[PDB]
């Protein structure tokens, strides 16, 4: 099953965060779809889920600000967190939850299984009958079988997640600059080259090379947060020094928060 | 903020066993049916164990889960570098709908081979100088353990400001990489004679230099 999150990467402080999840390859009217998030440096935090029909369920500590609706028509579930703060900046994952409450039949303490219960006890079955000794006053002690409840919960599939940042700062696309290889910056048969993705906001940014056709020796680094409030990162790929002139190398930068994609060809320096 | 109790950090050598505990109470782990999830940096969480002991599809047998009362345990045998991640347990709290997670356990796999950093210092590009900016990029890769210090020098003297350095992060080959930036004005870049990025790691210090006269 595919779980795709959609919504704003950026929400201003003390406003409402609206996220949508589009499920592809399942009906929305049985399988439970839930939301899990993780703030930076914090543990996974359960938010809520919607079950068959619309049995919504939230976290006791966040139900006042949380709201989850459901539209089987468009096969979409939505989440809403009101009056958000920096503590609500996190990756929000759409998930398919498997809720289930297994039931098991038992007798009270001291009672055992027996077939002595009368029909007036309304136990709903001959096997659902318990007996616990012979009381001196009441006589044969009859009682219906008690039903327990075993709670079952786990996450079957995880969406890729959508990173949300709570800030008053406005979105800014990236400026992509070449990190070109040089006659002195080589390492023998291999040469390092890359792209500098500078001054963007909010996170995240992803980078591929040659539209994914080139993956060996690629590493995109985590971003740095500058004093300006803008992020920057680099992506480097190791290539054969002898191919610099003939093979073309293009970094594919994706910054969904600003609906921007940049392809930058990295030319080899004459130096 | 109720969270199940997990050890902050655990360790184990390649090929050996490791155990990660998940202590809670009778309303959670006691009722049974605990689950485990793996979260590798840069990837969505992956479900490993559910129902205390059942493995999810595609999970290797070396991952196994158990439970003894109000404490569950994830055991990982034949450890390998790729197992380094954060591991969270979870369970329902007196309600098949509501769920609580654990504090999370970071696994450190010991005994991995060491490797020295490969440093490449890029001067500001022409494209950036045209925007009246000048950033020096120092990229560091293929080292282990993931611990380095970076120092910037201008004309054999230390840089007093303008530096930003990322924390080492794992590559696809399990070695660590890191990056450092020196933000300058086009004038400073042309004023000085050379700039250096110094990378210290396990007794060696690798220094890479650039100068605008080479450009």
Residue numbers in the entry:
A (entry chain H): 2 to 82, 82A, 82B, 82C, 83 to 269
B (entry chain L): 1 to 9, 11 to 27, 27A, 27B, 28 to 95, 95A, 95B, 96 to 106, ...
Passage from the reporting paper:
The cow antibody repertoire contains a unique subset (~10%) of antibodies possessing ultralong CDRH3s, which can reach lengths between 50 to 70 amino acids. The unique CDRH3 structure can be separated into two microdomains where the antigen-binding disulfide-bound “knob” sits on top of a long b-ribbon “stalk” and can bind to both surface and receded epitopes. Ultimately, we isolated a total of 8 and 11 cross-clade nAbs from cow-485 and cow-488, respectively, all of which had ultralong CDRH3s, suggesting only ultralong antibodies were responsible for cross-clade neutralization detected in sera. BnAbs from cow-485 were named Bess, while bnAbs from cow-488 were named ElsE and assigned numbers based on their order of discovery.
The ElsE Fabs all have CDRH3s with 54 amino acids and 4 cysteines, with a 1–3, 2–4 connectivity, Bess7 has a 61-amino acid CDRH3 with 8 cysteines (1–6, 2–5, 3–7, 4–8 connectivity), while the 55-amino acid CDRH3 knob region for Bess 4 (6 Cys, 1–3, 2–5, 4–6 connectivity) has no ordered electron density in the crystal structure. Ultralong bovine CDRH3 knob regions fold with 3 short β-strands connected by 2 loops (Loop1, Loop2) of varying lengths that can adopt a multitude of different secondary structures, including loops, helices and β-turns. The Bess7 knob is quite different from the ElsE knobs, with its Loop2 region folding as a long, 14-residue β-hairpin, with residues DEYA forming a slightly distorted type I β-turn at the penultimate tip. This hairpin turn bears some resemblance to the tip of the long β-hairpin CDRH3 found in human HIV-1 bnAb PGT145, where residues NETysG form a type I β-turn at the tip and superposition of Bess7 (using the EY tip residues) onto a trimer-bound PGT145 (using the ETys residues) shows that the stalk region is long enough to allow the body of the Fab to avoid clashes with the trimer. Bess7 is also notable for its interesting disulfide connectivity pattern between the 8 cysteines in its knob, with three (D gene positions 23, 24, 25) and two (D gene positions 39,40) sequential cysteines in the sequence. There is no convincing electron density to indicate tyrosine sulfation modifications in any of the antibody CDRH3 regions; however, BLI experiments indicate that Bess7, with 3 tyrosines in CDRH3, contains one or more sulfated tyrosines. Low sulfate occupancy or flexibility in the CDRH3 knob region may explain the lack of electron density for these groups.
